[PDB]
């Protein structure tokens, strides 16, 4: 308790003495309440012009027009401890999953080097601005890093001064640059060596990218058992337990020297006790506590995520073919039992998954799993929009089960060949393509960023009618020469000024393992649709007037973007489709 964040709320107070008090009316009742003291400050979402003015048909659509315009009563909940049964088969479950994750990496600290670079080529660290202006600039400072050497010192010591959350389905919780610098590198080797590649952990997809999610799916769907199970959870950041933070800690027993001190520090000081300041309109600052629930980095929050899904859905598929018969107590034979499941059957029961941090796939042995339910709600990962005790309805065609927001479409190439290609409805695709985060873009910077979505659409997106069309509008009407950028960066193999049709043989073909013939497509005409009536399914404007007129007309929308930007140098690639070739 207070001995562990007593330092840091002390420090924060005395920056504030002039504002210190304790508010009787404080809404929190979950959340350990401290103080509070005197501010004032809030980056809402802008429109992307260029993309918004060659999608004209889109403007009339609320779908795509609402997505551009406007539960923190789900972070002051709180999660039950899970009975002592449930605690012996995570613990058990954990111990095994590090070892299989372990067999073939080393774990090992980040270096400043490698992190600098990261700020340098634009990631989303999710850190705050004050003493330096950006994250750049306090990365080329040496003051910086003395702040860093300072609190890193006190890690070693088993203390903490300066690593507080700032709270902001979702909530970001920002933290201070130096914060992020030393959760980096304590636990960024699970994200920069791929511990949750699906080589190494099986039921993983970090960094196998949206061209191979479907290829994946359709893997699992070749084992014999029962249906897909793909259930989400109700707010999984919320329900990560104090069991579950402990259990996550144990990847510090394959570390040693200095980075298992550094790591059981991120562990024990900023995750298993946390302070946050809270903005309250009636504004004030609330400091307030607590031990349990997610709050880590974004990326660092992926790869726990995976490792917990992992580790639940083990349980559950244990469940399900009946390896143990009651959570209230393991009796000492069904541990050996557990142990022995594990040892005999476990790394194929991780084949038979697809995990995503909080988001996963199942297809299990049978179809018990569906009401293998008590494991599952006692780790409080409670499934969302079903009644707690009801059973799963799984899905009997991979081509229809969710995944990382999308499904899955075989489709035949003239020449036999066969392509999985991701999908989701098409006002979600149009409607983000059409925002922008963040203010201060010059018409330049807007233009690139268009040309990043045109150019994911064509690599990912190739098979909707309206997509390719769209694509290949914008790449006309964005100067040729012109990088794609993006703000906050799967694989981006559509992040390139090289020739689309040649990233596109690449991925689809070359590089493209489930791919025997290694034939080149020679032209954008080799390459396929969607069935009309499926492109329609999932969202196509085809067959409307709105939409025909827009096509017959696509060389005047084109025109009027290149006349805003400017005398610059232009491709029409508007001939790479059939009904423009002339
Ligand atoms: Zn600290
Ligand atoms: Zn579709």
């Not at 950041?237 to 200095?258: A, C, F, S």
């Not at 726990?304 to 349980?315: D, K, P, R, S, W």
Request: hydrophobic content about 35%.
């Amino acid at each position: 308790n207070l001995d562990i964040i007593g330092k840091r709320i002390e420090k924060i107070k005395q920056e504030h003495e002039t504002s210190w008090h304790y508010d009787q009316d404080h809404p929190y009742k979950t959340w350990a309440y401290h103080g509070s003291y005197e501010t004032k400050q809030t980056a809402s979402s802008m429109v992307n012009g260029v993309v918004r003015l060659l999608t004209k048909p889109w403007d009339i659509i609320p779908m795509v027009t609402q997505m551009a315009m406007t539960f923190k009563e789900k972070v002051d909940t709180r999660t039950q401890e899970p009975k002592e049964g449930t605690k012996k088969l995570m613990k058990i479950t954990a111990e095994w999953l590090w070892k299989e994750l372990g067999k073939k990496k080393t774990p090992r600290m980040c270096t400043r080097e490698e992190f600098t670079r990261k700020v340098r080529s634009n990631a989303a660290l999710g850190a705050i601005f004050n003493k330096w202006k950006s994250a750049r600039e306090a990365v080329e400072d040496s003051g910086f890093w003395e702040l860093v050497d300072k609190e890193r010192n006190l890690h070693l010591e088993g203390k903490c001064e300066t690593c507080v959350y700032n709270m902001m389905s979702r909530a970001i919780w920002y933290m201070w640059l130096g914060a992020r610098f030393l959760e980096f590198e304590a636990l960024g080797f699970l994200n920069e060596d791929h511990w949750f590649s699906r080589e190494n952990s099986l039921s993983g997809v970090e960094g196998e990218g949206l061209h191979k999610l479907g290829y994946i799916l359709r893997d699992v769907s070749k084992k014999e058992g029962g249906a897909m199970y793909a259930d989400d959870t109700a707010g999984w950041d919320t329900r990560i337990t104090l069991e579950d933070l402990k259990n996550e800690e144990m990847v510090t027993n394959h570390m040693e020297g200095e980075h298992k001190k550094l790591a059981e520090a991120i562990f024990k000081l900023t995750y298993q006790n946390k302070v946050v300041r809270v903005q309250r309109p009636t504004t004030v600052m609330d400091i307030i506590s607590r031990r349990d629930q997610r709050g880590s980095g974004q990326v660092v929050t992926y790869g726990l995520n995976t490792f917990t899904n992992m580790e639940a859905q083990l349980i559950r598929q244990m469940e399900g073919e009946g390896v143990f018969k009651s959570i209230q107590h393991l009796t000492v034979t069904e541990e050996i039992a557990v142990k022995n499941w594990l040892v005999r059957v476990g790394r194929e029961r991780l084949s038979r998954m697809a995990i995503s941090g909080d988001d996963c796939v199942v297809k299990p042995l049978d179809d018990r799993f569906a009401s293998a339910l008590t494991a599952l709600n006692d780790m409080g990962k409670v499934r969302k929009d079903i009644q707690q005790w009801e059973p799963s309805r799984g899905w009997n065609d991979w081509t229809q089960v969710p995944f990382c927001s999308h499904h899955f479409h075989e489709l035949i190439m003239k020449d036999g060949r066969v392509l999985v290609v991701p999908c989701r409805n098409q006002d979600e695709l149009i409607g983000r393509a059409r925002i922008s985060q963040g203010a201060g873009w010059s018409l330049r910077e807007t233009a690139c960023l268009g040309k990043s979505y045109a150019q994911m659409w064509s690599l990912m997106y190739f098979h909707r009618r309206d997509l390719r069309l769209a694509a290949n509008a914008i790449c006309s009407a964005v100067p040729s020469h012109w990088v794609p950028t993006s703000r906050t960066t799967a694989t981006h193999e559509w992040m390139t000024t090289e020739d689309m049709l040649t990233v596109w043989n690449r991925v689809w073909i070359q590089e493209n393992p489930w791919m025997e013939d290694k034939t080149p497509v020679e032209s954008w005409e080799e390459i396929p649709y969607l069935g009309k009536r499926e492109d329609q399914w999932c969202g196509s404007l085809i067959g409307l007037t709105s939409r025909a007129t827009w096509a017959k007309n696509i060389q005047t929308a084109i025109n009027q973007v290149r006349s805003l930007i400017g005398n610059e140098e232009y491709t029409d690639y508007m001939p790479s489709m059939k009904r423009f070739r002339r």
